[PDB]
Symmetry: C2
Subunit: 324 residues, 2 copies
């Protein structure tokens, strides 16, 4: 397996956007040297729960400041951005970094964002697919020629052309069944979300697998990713309490209909939170029920830098290093 790191960059009343970014940078540098495989960037708009609106811009600096690791967009929302712009941007990252960029994308998750980006809601999936078609066309051919109600424009050359044949590796955030089946037919690898339950995650995997074989897809060769929150404390009970506060607002905005306490409790126990073992096992379960080949972890919940790096070190030392 491959083990990497993701940054959510959640902000708060005390913990500022300035701080988070800096922490992100310091950590990135810290693990540069280690056995971590990839550094993923979470996109979020208009809220405390993620201060990175432009994952691609962040990826440029991250790639710029590094030489080792791979950098990826975790959930680049294509559905609310112009596909041509995405292609160009992704292409530039691919070239500048000589193929170290990985393109993680997603459909629009919040209705607000969609409306906010003057995007037709009633046909979201169609638009998402269309946006995707434009991007992949660019990646794979160097050009685009849409002729539809979403886009209609004279054939164009999209510069720069991909450094990596076929464009930078792609992956789809598993946000829904529609998207999952879509990805299965295309045979693209997914990204199972740390915010979802194990059940959901598994159902999703059963879905993809079913669809994918149904499409002549060699599943054994598909490397799904999984994201999980990591927070290890000798006092397992404290680990939970710390992540709880870190996820308060997220749970209160993202998972509204769903009763709070139940979800919050589910997250604390399903994520790699608690003591070493507790932590370690949760991870094993998660992987197990979703079949992911690679893991990405977020250690951000650990407000203690000394404690956080410590955790990072054992994980690399006790886990990572072995898979190499």
């Amino acid at each position: 397996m491959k083990f990497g790191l993701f940054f959510l960059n959640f902000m708060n009343s005390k913990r500022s956007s300035d701080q988070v970014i800096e922490e992100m940078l310091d950590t990135a540098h810290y693990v540069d040297q280690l056995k971590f495989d990839t550094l993923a960037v979470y996109e979020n708009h208009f809220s405390n729960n993620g201060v990175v609106g432009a994952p691609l811009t962040v990826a440029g600096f991250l790639l710029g400041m590094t030489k080792n690791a791979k950098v990826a967009s975790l959930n680049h929302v294509i559905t609310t951005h112009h596909p041509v712009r995405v292609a160009e941007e992704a292409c530039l990252l691919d070239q500048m970094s000589e193929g170290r960029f990985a393109f993680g994308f997603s459909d629009c998750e919040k209705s607000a964002d969609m409306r906010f980006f003057n995007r037709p809601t009633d046909s979201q999936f169609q638009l998402f697919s269309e946006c995707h078609k434009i991007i992949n066309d660019a990646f794979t051919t160097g050009y685009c020629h849409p002729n539809n109600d979403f886009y209609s424009f004279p054939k164009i050359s999209v510069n720069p052309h991909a450094f990596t044949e076929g464009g930078p590796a792609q992956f789809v955030n598993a946000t829904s069944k529609e998207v999952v089946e879509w990805a299965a037919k295309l045979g693209l690898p997914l990204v199972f979300r740390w915010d979802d339950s194990n059940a959901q995650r598994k159902e999703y995997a059963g879905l993809y697998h079913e669809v994918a074989q149904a499409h002549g897809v060699d599943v054994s060769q598909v490397r799904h990713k999984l994201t999980l929150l990591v927070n290890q404390n000798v006092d397992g009970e404290a680990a939970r309490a710390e992540a709880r506060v870190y996820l308060e607002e997220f749970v209160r905005e993202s998972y509204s209909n769903t009763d709070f306490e139940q979800k919050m409790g589910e997250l604390l126990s399903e994520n790699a939170i608690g003591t070493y073992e507790e932590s370690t096992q949760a991870a094993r379960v998660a992987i197990e029920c979703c079949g992911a080949a690679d893991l990405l972890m977020s250690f951000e919940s650990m407000e203690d830098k000394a404690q956080q790096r410590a955790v990072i070190d054992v994980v690399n030392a006790n886990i990572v290093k072995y898979h190499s």
Copy 2:
């Protein structure tokens, strides 16, 4: 006077997109430990005359791989881009680099280019002024509230909030009198374009000065920039020749409705091309015409790497000694 570099990143059948990106990268590094103050990036779409459509993404990488270096968008076309996105993107860079990014922006230099990204209009300059309005609001307040017609969205927050108080330094491309007047009115510094004639630049410079002062602006503190192409050769004729081939399709493209030979001949003579002497002379002249505070140069037209780097060498020593 400050001296910086700019990248056009022009490709051709012979010189691929890959090639030119690499050279920029190398170049940026090579120049890092020098006296050059800034690294500027040119935006272009769907053509060989500029392979960088997102100078902001390039700015991130460039700043990421440098530490002392100043990086800027040369002519970011805001008109075609969501103003909100633009503000986040730029605030991110401001944060990440800790104040080392400069936001050089522009107004659509093409028409057809508009269609490929937004809803083209005629009241385009209005869209542009309103876009910049949104952008500067965040830059200065962290929030924006376009009550207007182009954009209407209630009070919203833009993260990250800026690293530099007031947002990153800004500068506008003098693409027309309309824009020049707007900038002046707002007290913004301009970027005089290497592709424009010395007379136009002087004009713009004069317009800016008059409008600005009448508006209570402190012109003394305005530091406009100027771009120029740089191609020095023992054989001044060989320098023009090389530059001519590099500028061929561009002249044909950006200046399709004017006499070719004349423009061409104008560019080759007013830019810092020729012999060292002709090059420097040409430079002084252009600087004196528009009165730029800082000079950004492009040395890309010199295909021979050793010759190019040498020119860069000569320039730097030259700044170290008198600047």
